[PDB]
Design a protein around this nucleic acid. Sequence first.
RNA 1: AAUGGGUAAUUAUAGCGAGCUAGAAAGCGUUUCCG
Length: 151
Amino acid sequence: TLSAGIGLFADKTPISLMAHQTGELEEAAKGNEKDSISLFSSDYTFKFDRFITNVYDDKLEQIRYFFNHQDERGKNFIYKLIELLRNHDRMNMARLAYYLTRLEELTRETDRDKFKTFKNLFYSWYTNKNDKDRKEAELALLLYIYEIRKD
RNA sequence: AAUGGGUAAUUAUAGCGAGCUAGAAAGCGUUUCCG
């Protein structure tokens, strides 16, 4: 198998700093199980199979299918979900539960069913104890809010 | 009958509990001493 580190950098930067930082990323990926990919950071070191079949093909398609077929929720909901994924106390489970149930009712009753499906999926992979589906969801939201930013 | 007195409840009830934009952007990634 093979293991990879994928950095992410703005333009007009060196290729020595860049190569060294993603070398540190591939070494943090080597340290995991040496079958692993570290997108962008020293955490986020996923196994490669879980990155393919549980981040692209599972979570990020279900995020993209939500936020492109509704108008009322936007960037702000995504940023406030990213924060609750990044903190994750025991209290933030209840706070995320209150937030998502509180935004059930605010939808147009035509999109309340689709928001309810997204509510159930996001709460289910927030309160999963195994800590796989939580950092995978955080990375899926990072990639999705990367790929929809304007100038 | 006259006289002297007031007494018992309820003290807020039902909701909303924040929403959407922005989530960093331009520059500089080496220069001099040195051959």
